[PDB]
Amino acid sequence: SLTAKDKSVVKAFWGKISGKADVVGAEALGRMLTAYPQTKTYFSHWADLSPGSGPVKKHGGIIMGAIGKAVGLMDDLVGGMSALSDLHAFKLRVDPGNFKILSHNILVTLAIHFPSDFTPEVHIAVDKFLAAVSAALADKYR
Amino acid sequence: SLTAKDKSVVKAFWGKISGKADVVGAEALGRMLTAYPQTKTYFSHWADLSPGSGPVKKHGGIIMGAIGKAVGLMDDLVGGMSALSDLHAFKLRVDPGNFKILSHNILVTLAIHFPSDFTPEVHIAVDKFLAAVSAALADKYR
Amino acid sequence: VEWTDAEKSTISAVWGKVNIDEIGPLALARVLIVYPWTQRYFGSFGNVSTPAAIMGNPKVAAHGKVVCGALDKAVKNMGNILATYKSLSETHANKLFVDPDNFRVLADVLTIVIAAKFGASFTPEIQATWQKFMKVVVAAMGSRYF
Amino acid sequence: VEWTDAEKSTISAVWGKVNIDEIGPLALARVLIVYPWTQRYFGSFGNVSTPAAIMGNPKVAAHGKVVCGALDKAVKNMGNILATYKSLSETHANKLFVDPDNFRVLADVLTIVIAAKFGASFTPEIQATWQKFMKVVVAAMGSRYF
Numbered sequence: 001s002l003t004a005k006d007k008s009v010v011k012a013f014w015g016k017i018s019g020k021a022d023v024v025g026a027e028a029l030g031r032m033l034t035a036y037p038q039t040k041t042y043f044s045h046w047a048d049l050s051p052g053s054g055p056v057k058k059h060g061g062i063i064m065g066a067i068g069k070a071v072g073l074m075d076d077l078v079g080g081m082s083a084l085s086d087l088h089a090f091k092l093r094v095d096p097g098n099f100k101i102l103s104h105n106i107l108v109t110l111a112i113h114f115p116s117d118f119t120p121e122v123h124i125a126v127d128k129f130l131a132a133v134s135a136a137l138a139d140k141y142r
Numbered sequence: 143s144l145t146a147k148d149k150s151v152v153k154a155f156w157g158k159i160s161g162k163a164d165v166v167g168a169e170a171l172g173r174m175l176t177a178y179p180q181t182k183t184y185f186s187h188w189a190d191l192s193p194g195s196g197p198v199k200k201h202g203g204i205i206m207g208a209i210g211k212a213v214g215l216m217d218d219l220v221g222g223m224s225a226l227s228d229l230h231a232f233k234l235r236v237d238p239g240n241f242k243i244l245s246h247n248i249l250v251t252l253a254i255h256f257p258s259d260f261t262p263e264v265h266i267a268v269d270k271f272l273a274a275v276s277a278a279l280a281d282k283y284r
Numbered sequence: 285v286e287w288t289d290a291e292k293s294t295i296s297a298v299w300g301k302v303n304i305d306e307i308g309p310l311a312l313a314r315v316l317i318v319y320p321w322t323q324r325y326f327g328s329f330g331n332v333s334t335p336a337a338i339m340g341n342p343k344v345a346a347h348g349k350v351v352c353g354a355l356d357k358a359v360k361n362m363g364n365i366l367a368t369y370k371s372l373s374e375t376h377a378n379k380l381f382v383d384p385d386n387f388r389v390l391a392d393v394l395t396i397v398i399a400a401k402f403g404a405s406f407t408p409e410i411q412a413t414w415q416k417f418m419k420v421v422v423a424a425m426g427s428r429y430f
Numbered sequence: 431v432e433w434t435d436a437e438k439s440t441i442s443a444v445w446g447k448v449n450i451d452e453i454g455p456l457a458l459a460r461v462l463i464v465y466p467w468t469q470r471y472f473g474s475f476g477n478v479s480t481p482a483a484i485m486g487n488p489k490v491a492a493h494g495k496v497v498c499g500a501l502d503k504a505v506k507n508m509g510n511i512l513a514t515y516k517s518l519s520e521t522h523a524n525k526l527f528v529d530p531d532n533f534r535v536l537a538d539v540l541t542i543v544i545a546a547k548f549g550a551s552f553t554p555e556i557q558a559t560w561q562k563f564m565k566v567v568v569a570a571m572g573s574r575y576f
């Protein structure tokens with residue numbers, strides 16, 4: 001339940017991180033698979049699941065672009081993310097407890113790349129935003 | 143994210159339980175403090191914290207009358223329970239993990255009292271509503 | 285944990301009025317219906333297509349009974365549940381990769397189901413020790429999760 | 431659990447670049463800022479009223495270093511962590527009544543601070559054994575909740 005202030009900080013922080021979004025994405029996914037191995041069952045059709053692999057790289061940018069588009073849909077995230085909630089609920093059947101894991105690794109990747117920028121006040125808003133993207137993705141499950 | 147199906151099942155069932163509401167609230171509260179003792183610190187100014195005590199009874203009906211009202215506010219709950227969010231957020235500052243505890247105990251008491259009516263399909267919709275009431279209440283925390 | 289002798293009889297006594305051939309199925313079926321993402325762990329089960337289809341499925345029923353069989357030895361062994369549940373924790377962790385949050389979801393659903401069956405004889409104080417026991421079980425299940 | 435010799439060395443190698451006096455106060459302060467309900471547990475600390483207030487608080491500073499010394503004993507004693515932490519677990523549960531989910535929130539914020547501190551040398555791999563150590567700790571802390 002993102003406020004006006006939460007929205008300003010995400011849009012601005014989002015602007016400085018924009019440029020490295022592929023790098024952030026690919027690294028954030030590779031870390032999820034590497035430190036949280038229960039998530040590996042969902043990507044078994046891939047040739048490599050090692051950090052920096054080709055499929056890891058490419059899917060990482062995909063995830064970051066979707067987050068990017070969520071940025072502009074901040075006023076209605078369940079509406080905006082409906083199709084992706086179905087894909088993950090029914091087609092992929094991803095247990096919704098994995099959304100938290102993906103979000104924690106994205107914050108870890110941000111702290112590693114923008115330490116001075118990732119302040120406690122930037123962390124609150126990004127955390128809230130990421131929790132809200134998650135909730136929108138887990139909305140069509142039941 | 144309550145569907146049209148979900149609100150109808152909620153309202154229908156609510157019609158069935160309405161009459162016993164003060165008993166269900168009272169009983170669910172008494173179960174929470176007795177089965178989950180970490181909730182007890184919030185109610186220290188109360189004389190008796192045991193199942194069936196006076197204040198335990200009186201407060202349990204206060205809770206069911208609040209939930210009874212959320213039944214009518216199902217199109218906008220975060221908006222509908224704003225004032226209750228503040229109270230629990232800043233006046234009482236309740237650890238929000240206790241919202242799931244109360245919610246489980248209300249489900250345990252509905253089954254005790256309406257075992258025939260408390261069908262799996264009634265369970266999906268009351269669970270969803272109760273979770274949605276918990277998420278509206280935790281809105282003003284940060 | 286320390287189990288009092290009164291704790292332990294209370295448990296055997298509640299489990300005593302429990303029939304696995306009926307409770308087992310009620311709880312696993314209620315779980316796949318209220319938390320539908322759990323269906324994905326059970327691939328070979330059949331027509332889980334509707335609640336009715338879940339509710340009358342015989343593979344579902346069979347597993348529900350298997351599950352209450354493991355709980356049976358917990359009751360029988362309240363002092364070695366960790367000992368007793370090591371490879372169960374290992375298959376679920378390493379073989380099936382079950383998110384451990386789901387052990388919790390199952391325990392709460394078995395409780396609603398027992399509640400519904402015992403009515404008002406399922407009291408706060410019985411509930412209170414049933415809970416202690418349920419979290420001792422849940423802990424044993426997530427013990428080989430590393 | 432089973433720790434390999436290389437695993438153990440990775441941990442004491444990670445813990446070795448960490449300065450309790452720096453990371454202690456950073457992590458606990460962040461925990462009180464990002465998950466503000468955690469503040470109600472810390473009664474005497476004072477003016478927590480703002481992030482600036484929280485960040486400049488010395489009672490907070492100091493408890494952050496208290497928490498890090500407890501973690502140091504786990505690093506020193508990677509074998510008896512369950513034994514090491516029985517009394518800590520008992521106090522958080524029966525004296526303090528801390529909802530046990532807060533242990534994972536804390537573990538996650540400490541990890542973000544170390545990452546921002548270590549930068550690129552905090553690798554996926556390292557993160558991976560750092561993460562196995564944090565779940566053991568979280569296990570040990572929530573061990574006497576019954």
Ligand code: HEM
Nearest residue numbers: 039042043062063066067084092094098099102133134137
């Ligand atoms: C906020 C979180 C997430 C976002 C924004 C997101 C976004 C996406 C997007 C945009 C796609 C591509 C779909 C297409 O081709 O139309 C996708 C696919 C997929 N997602 Fe996610 N996802 C998220 C979380 C997760 C998590 C946590 C998991 C598993 C742990 C997961 C598993 C998958 C899989 C297995 C695919 C298909 C991969 C492929 O293209 O081969 N997703 N997701």
Ligand code: HEM
Nearest residue numbers: 181184185204205208209230234236240241244275276279
């Ligand atoms: C959805 C769940 C809940 C609802 C609908 C609810 C509702 C209420 C209401 C309507 C009041 C009275 C406020 C007034 O008079 O304006 C109240 C007070 C209070 N609530 Fe809650 N509550 C919930 C959950 C909880 C939980 C989980 C706890 C503790 C863990 C809690 C602790 C308190 C306390 C300590 C008070 C003070 C009331 C008194 O003693 O007079 N509440 N709540």
Ligand code: HEM
Nearest residue numbers: 322325326327350351354355375380382386387390391425
């Ligand atoms: C109360 C906690 C639980 C207990 C005591 C329990 C017990 C058991 C037992 C005794 C088995 C026998 C399998 C073998 O011997 O290899 C089993 C298998 C299995 N369990 Fe659990 N279980 C629990 C919770 C869960 C949950 C919540 C899930 C997933 C949502 C799950 C998923 C599975 C699966 C997929 C199998 C394999 C059976 C098959 O696919 O044929 N379990 N469980």
Ligand code: HEM
Nearest residue numbers: 468471472473496497500501521526528532533536537571
């Ligand atoms: C990360 C795991 C944690 C560890 C290792 C830890 C360690 C400690 C230690 C060593 C003490 C000193 C007490 C004594 O020796 O008597 C303490 C006290 C305390 N802890 Fe924790 N703690 C952890 C997590 C938490 C969390 C997440 C919270 C609440 C959100 C919390 C709340 C408290 C409080 C309120 C005190 C009392 C101290 C005072 O008021 O002076 N702890 N903890």
